[PDB]
Specification:
heterotrimer; A: 84 residues; mainly beta; 4-stranded antiparallel sheet; 3-stranded antiparallel sheet; globular; B: 108 residues; alpha+beta; two-stranded antiparallel sheet; 5 helices; Nucleoprotein (chain B); viral protein/immune system
């Protein structure tokens, strides 16, 4: 809904969190008999490039915001997208 | 028909249709038990819940408002907190009513 | 100023008579302070010439509860209902460029007040 994957793969998301430190991005095959892979992006950026993968298999890119503790910590949650 | 933020959820037009499924995602609503999802503003205990919803003025006066720009588009972000009055005779029932609706979906 | 105050904070209407600072406290960086409004909006509340153009982004009650990440916080300062979300501007609307211009004016205004 808010996460976009513009081909050439470039992931982009709006900052919906209070006092973001950094992000944690996970990616692997939707379903899939592997664990997701995990890399970190500075607080200041809200894009990331994903290279590798495979065409034809579905992917789930999830964005996690690591943030200062606040009144909104308790209710926060990731953004995700599915593409191929 | 109406833009999301102006939509009224009713018996005809459920919370799921108007506001999407309840969910853990930052951009998903988390509030409402099965009964609320199904009745919206027709819900028996709506005005007990509605007394906590800000007016336009108070929305813009109390909250923290941001702007975020990306491909998906342009998002106006809002973040705030409404202080419950603990002298209020009905304080307890206000709390238990709110807590029953928060994160309800996780158990259904 | 006496009657517009008795209302609980979240049902108050800011006017020239009862202003944004009176209704809703100072603009500030603190987690429970507001940060929207230039000096004219602050002083004028809902009498601002362009209030309806800001109003249209305010959520109905249904939407407040339907869209937001809703939360509870229990602290020595008391018990709080927390809310966050995001409202998508329609960039297909003819006034989109103006909407952005108007809201920019106000967002974190207080930080460039003389």
């Amino acid at each position: 809904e808010v996460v976009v994957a513009t081909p050439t793969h470039l992931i982009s998301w709006p900052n919906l969190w209070y006092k973001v430190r950094y992000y944690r991005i996970t990616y692997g095959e939707t379903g899939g008999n592997s664990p997701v892979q995990e890399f970190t992006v500075p607080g200041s950026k809200s894009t990331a490039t994903i290279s590798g993968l495979k065409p034809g298999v579905d992917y789930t890119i999830t964005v996690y915001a690591v943030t200062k503790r606040s009144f909104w910590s308790n209710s926060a949650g990731p953004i995700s997208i599915n593409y191929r | 028909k109406k833009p999301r933020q102006k939509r009224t959820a009713t018996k005809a037009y459920n919370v799921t249709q108007a506001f999407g499924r309840r969910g853990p995602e930052q951009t998903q609503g988390n509030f409402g038990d099965q009964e609320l999802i199904r009745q919206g503003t027709d819900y028996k205990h709506w005005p007990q819940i509605a007394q906590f919803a800000p007016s336009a003025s108070a929305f813009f006066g109390m909250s923290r408002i941001g702007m975020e720009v990306t491909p998906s588009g342009t998002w106006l972000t809002y973040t705030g907190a409404i202080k419950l009055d603990d002298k209020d005779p009905n304080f307890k029932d206000q709390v238990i009513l709110l807590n029953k609706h928060i994160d309800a979906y996780k158990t259904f």
